[PDB]
Symmetry: C2
Subunit: 298 residues, 2 copies
Amino acid sequence: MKCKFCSREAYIKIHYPKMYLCEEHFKEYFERKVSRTIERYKLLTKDERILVAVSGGKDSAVTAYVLKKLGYNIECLHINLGISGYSEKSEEYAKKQCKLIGAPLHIVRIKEILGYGIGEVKTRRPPCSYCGLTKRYIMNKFAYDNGFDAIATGHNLDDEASFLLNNILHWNTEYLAKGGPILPQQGKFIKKVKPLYEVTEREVVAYALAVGLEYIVEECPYTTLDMKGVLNELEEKRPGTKFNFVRGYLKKKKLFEPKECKICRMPSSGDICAFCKFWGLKKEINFKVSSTDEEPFG
Amino acid sequence: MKCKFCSREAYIKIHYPKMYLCEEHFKEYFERKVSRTIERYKLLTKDERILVAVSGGKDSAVTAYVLKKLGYNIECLHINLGISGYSEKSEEYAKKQCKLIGAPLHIVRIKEILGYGIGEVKTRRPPCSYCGLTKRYIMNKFAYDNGFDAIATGHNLDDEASFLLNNILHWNTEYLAKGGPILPQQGKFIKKVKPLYEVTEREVVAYALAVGLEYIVEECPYTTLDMKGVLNELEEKRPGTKFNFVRGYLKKKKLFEPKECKICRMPSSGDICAFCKFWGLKKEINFKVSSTDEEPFG
Ligand SMILES: [Zn+2]
Ligand SMILES: [Zn+2]
Ligand SMILES: [Zn+2]
Ligand SMILES: [Zn+2]
């Protein structure tokens, strides 16, 4: 097959709208779509200082890559989970990505600041579950401490769809109230946006490979995959299913709609916050930085 | 394997709770579960005159069969869809079932009273879609005209689950407000109940075969199957999924919660009702009967 817009060999078939595209015209389509998403939902403006949490996975990598190419002011943060025999390679993937992207990369090593790696704490709570708590907290407090205006994550259409299906099966109506491409700044919660909201996981894979981004497959090696497979099954039966599901969700989201921590002063239900209680912290963590390990002199 | 309660060969494995059961102890388990369901949701009382809409399918057949065995006062209604080469065999299956069950069977032939069989109307609305409208209307007006206290249908756990998943994918929040095992009597809408709410489709199949009920597979031969397959997939991955989904739904159902027809005087949004407008009816249909074709003299 040949590209819709030139004589080059097709690199990928895009379903909506229907067109075969070569590598370069696919890149352009992908970048335009992401730009369209930012515009439609008013996610970002070019004056904002944006932080991208880069796990070394494809999604956050492509996010930082495209925001950069689009001309946004982005810096990246990699949160090293402290798993011996795992996290070192992950951090290396994130570093290589940011070098390629040309974004400053800040690193927080959980094991260094908290004393323990993910999967080393004496608790029966699943490693990846307190991992999620810990990571979200650090992303936000780092963004906050350093005066960032926004955090962009790499959640794509397939992520939103699978998260939606999962939370509906479990009737997690609280989670269901808080979906969509944007969580507006609210107190010490920094604005969080999802620029890849409307691109598919398949398009993300294709984009990374097109621009020479290399990535790891699994951030925490300790369901979503079940949901994605189910949704992929349904999608092949009835193309348009995933998109239709999310669109419907955005319209009905409203139906799910019905302090400061004594340690770190970040938002807290209860007087001491979840992060602080779990980690047994008596003192605040200061994530303020004046430079990166890679550019110590500015 | 041997039965949990005797020395007979296992007929089926029940998952919740875990037990192998012979034919007779399975029948007993199934009948008890249905009885438990009626009790828990206050669906029916033994004094009520109950109508079961029997399609010739396994679900309505087992419903009428068990309500009868439990000692309820049940009569059956078969609504013949008027499909040449299809409906005759379906009606015959319903007749044989009611003979076996020992319930009076009333028959309404759509083609006789309306002039047209399902799939013969000059409309682009899917045959099975106006079939659904027509059938629900007739069931209710027949129950009403004849002074029945309740209509019992054969929807089982798998039906509720698949209907739920389908309507959530489409965000049919109106439909979502109206689920669960009971729709209380409301004006000329007769009380509708689902006694098989807590038994699985697999248990229904096993019960019919155990009691010698024969049935057709498809009422209207012109998605749910897609949903059931998906849900069966998920169930084998994580047993307990279907039940958990419905239980969660019952608890959250509340979140979806926000006349008389000029022709037939049955409930109508708009001054003329959907049934009447579709069929272009200028006159009411009187479903009052003094007897059955099989017992013309009482
Ligand atoms: Zn091209
Ligand atoms: Zn705190
Ligand atoms: Zn037995
Ligand atoms: Zn009417």
